[PDB]
Amino acid sequence: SFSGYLKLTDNVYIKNADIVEEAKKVKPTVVVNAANVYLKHGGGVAGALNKATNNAMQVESDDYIATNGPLKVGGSCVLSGHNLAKHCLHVVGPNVNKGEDIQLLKSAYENFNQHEVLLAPLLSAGIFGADPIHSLRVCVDTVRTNVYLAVFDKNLYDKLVSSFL
Ligand SMILES: Cn1ccc(C(=O)Nc2cccc(C(=O)O)c2)n1
Numbered sequence: 001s002f003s004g005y006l007k008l009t010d011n012v013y014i015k016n017a018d019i020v021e022e023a024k025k026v027k028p029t030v031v032v033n034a035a036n037v038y039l040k041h042g043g044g045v046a047g048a049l050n051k052a053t054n055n056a057m058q059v060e061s062d063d064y065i066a067t068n069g070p071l072k073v074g075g076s077c078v079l080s081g082h083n084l085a086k087h088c089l090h091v092v093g094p095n096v097n098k099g100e101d102i103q104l105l106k107s108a109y110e111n112f113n114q115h116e117v118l119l120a121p122l123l124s125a126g127i128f129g130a131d132p133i134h135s136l137r138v139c140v141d142t143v144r145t146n147v148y149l150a151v152f153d154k155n156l157y158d159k160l161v162s163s164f165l
Pocket residue numbers: 125126127129130131132152153156
């Protein structure tokens with residue numbers, strides 16, 4: 001089960017950890033991927049999760065896209081968790097580096113409410129370009145289910161905890 005997490009609110013928890021390593025240890029029911037609309041798991045959390053599945057997540061995702069077309073920014077899809085989790089909830093947060101509307105971050109987090117417990121990264125943080133402090137605030141104000149946030153970067157983790165209102 002989840003260990004070493006700091007409780008932020010009644011339902012949001014945070015830990016300075018590699019989400020891939022957290023997933024392999026916990027094997028949660030749901031691991032959230034920081035996905036793009038095309039499910040092209042190239043870099044950041046998506047690239048790391050996909051590489052941990054030996055590219056099985058990408059093969060599965062390409063078949064999903066061939067059948068269904070791309071996701072919407074703010075949307076999600078449930079696919080296999082492979083060796084990491086029972087399921088992977090691929091959530092598309094807005095990518096600020098691609099000029100996408102930051103207001104879609106709340107819609108993206110609403111996808112977590114369909115799952116009772118999730119292991120997740122901060123949406124739109126990292127290479128997506130949004131302020132991680134803002135992402136954590138939208139997370140605690142939007143997600144009502146139990147979310148265990150894994151923040152890879154130690155310095156960012158410390159900044160997030162020390163600035164949490
Ligand atoms: C105001 N602003 C926008 C972006 C940032 C910012 O510090 N982003 C950032 C930088 C380094 C790592 C990570 C991460 O999620 O791993 C995120 N600050």
